[PDB]
Design a protein around this ligand. Structure first.
Ligand SMILES: [Zn+2]
Ligand SMILES: [Zn+2]
Ligand SMILES: [Zn+2]
Ligand SMILES: [Zn+2]
Lengths: 227, 219, 220, 220
């Protein structure tokens, strides 16, 4: 009967797809601090999710543009544990850039809701979002969903340095150190502390960046080593 | 530099008191009402009170038909702050609007900038979901926002025995209240309510920095 | 398939029996600091397990009800808990008798002999003072919690009690339902050794032959 | 908080420490080849898993003089090292002299690294993994972990080409959950795996005198 510490089954053939999405659609102009900085985020996330047993796919949204997104949402995951989708964005941006991102996040999360994605029903769906038609909010829907945000609704966000961004650097450091050792919600709480304590001051306030994860998960999530 | 980063740091629960578990039942602009819902909301309030009193809380509940002293009085002797927001399932467009305004102004009082005593201390707001800043999203560090319903999902109607989300919250708080870290506790409420599709999907938004454990006190 | 954090089931009707056994045989002219020095351990430990949902049965050797403990059905019970209590300064007969009493208690509840407790954790909390004079015995799902290891120097009971039982009960109130039981004993191992008031440090031990993790989540 | 509830041993020191593999090859006359290498597959399996954890593996036998590089192990500074790991290996079917010699070899190894004798490892966990075949199974010491292949009342495995089930599954757990789980939780998995791999059931044991939790997070 009822178990106070039930975990999602991690004994499926593969761990699944860690989709990485860097929002570059309507951004101009760009600089090498941010360019290689976003690269540093993407390169760092890839190696960390590859370590946890994920099949990493990343596509830029400037480039069949939706067909590369269909095959991911359309292909079966019955052999997989979970789905991870990382959304990367630029700190600075025009009003349109930030608008398209909110539309992309909305349509991207909607594809993996139980009504459309049969294979991932009862399986955790983690969307890691870098925050930057009247339904304009940072809140989507779905059961067994994990929404990870770099910034809480009204807070200040990092500018992307050459080495990357505050939220991503810290996420990868914790994923590298405790990725298979901790339940993922405890893991994100460490990212919550590390980023908020890292209130450092380059046009400072100084305002602190407060991350937030919205959890609709039903069980404990653990990325125990596979194979 | 005596003891560095700890992967499992918990909020200090060795303060004189555990704190105040404020209960708030939104009744301001609701008409008309029925005994299924009336004694049902009572069942929620009566059930939460006994469960938080078990965990060592000083419970205060006030109807909004009749707040500073709670947000203004010092909590330097306390572990944390809990605020439960109760609402009626059915409601006019104004009723649901006032609730969103109350939640906004209530959470804003305990943000670090105003509440000095609760800085570095967990603030848990359990919300029963029912001027352009109209959203279910407030702000603050070390904040725990517990929602009965995710943004677009269906919510229970309040039976005589109470509501789905609250009944399950109290059952888990009675069984594992001092035994589990509170986020693991809420995940059990997330499963129990969603499986009880007789779907309502709960969601907790966590801005906490440490592990939260309501270990028994007074020793 | 590979059960990584597999725990013993804790959903059965009753949690089980807390069996407190105080060694009161061949201890001639026992002092009062040990007399209801021990009471404060018995009445402290009979509270903490009862707070965990155990049925506490206290009986002394000073006074056939022993076969009535093993004979009962545990098919609806989670675990067996038997805490063994004794006084510090005793003659060699008191020391010898205790060893044989742990043989019969421990050998009585070996899965092959007691079939109702098979697969169900048996925690023996020992307070220590044939050609088989040894500290360790055998058994699957067995947990042997020793007050102090070999090469040991034992505490003297005062008007609360013994540091091991003192801090053991203390951990059961603070982390009994919240932590895995082996993690709880690790805290006792640190607490009792650090509570080295006056000149050595008492090093306690627990022997684990457990197959699964152990958590005392409140029943029902 | 003052009360350290999930306190772990520090794992931030320069080097993790030494993995000391000791294979008992004395007074084992006419050893069969299935035991010969055999044991190699255990030594070359365990020398990989600890080295994968950041340990420096030193393999030396008693067959070789073997007693004088032994003082060179305890004498080294551990002030920059996290732990001491010493895995003790032996073959199954041996004469009474082979059984007697092993017991005394565990005395000197265990007594050599008692905190009072080795001061550089004080407060730092000492994990002794024993493979078994003052004559007793248990010794003393703080921050000491005695991992036994099988408890008393035991029936030991016979080494084949791969090796011994305990070392087989021990290494297996170190690859799957070595860096991911607390070390006592890892042994609990070994305790279940080896007993269930009963192709009676071999019941292994670990004695814990540890004050803190133990996790092998990858260094730096
Ligand atoms: Zn876990
Ligand atoms: Zn805890
Ligand atoms: Zn536990
Ligand atoms: Zn750990």
């Amino acid at each position: 009967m009822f178990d106070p510490a039930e975990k999602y089954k991690m004994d499926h053939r593969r761990r699944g797809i860690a989709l990485i999405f860097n929002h570059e659609r309507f951004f101009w102009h760009l600089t090498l601090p941010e360019r290689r900085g976003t690269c540093a985020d993407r390169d760092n996330l890839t190696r960390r999710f590859s370590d946890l047993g994920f099949e990493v796919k990343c596509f830029n949204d400037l480039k069949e543009l939706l067909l590369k997104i269909h095959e991911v949402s359309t292909v079966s995951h019955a052999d997989a544990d979970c789905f991870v989708c990382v959304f990367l964005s630029h700190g600075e941006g025009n009003h349109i850039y930030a608008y398209d991102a909110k539309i992309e996040i909305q349509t991207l999360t909607g594809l993996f809701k139980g009504d459309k994605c049969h294979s991932l029903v009862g399986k955790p769906k983690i969307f890691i979002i870098q925050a930057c038609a009247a339904s304009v909010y940072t809140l989507p829907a779905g059961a067994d969903f994990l929404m990870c945000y770099s910034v809480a609704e009204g807070y200040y966000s990092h500018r992307e340095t050459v080495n990357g961004s505050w939220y991503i650097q810290d996420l990868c450091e914790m994923l590298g150190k405790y990725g298979s050792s901790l339940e993922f919600t405890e893991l994100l709480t460490l990212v919550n502390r590390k980023v908020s304590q890292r209130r450092v001051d380059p046009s400072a306030i100084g305002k602190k960046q407060v991350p937030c994860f919205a959890s609709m998960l039903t069980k404990k999530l653990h990325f125990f080593p596979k194979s």
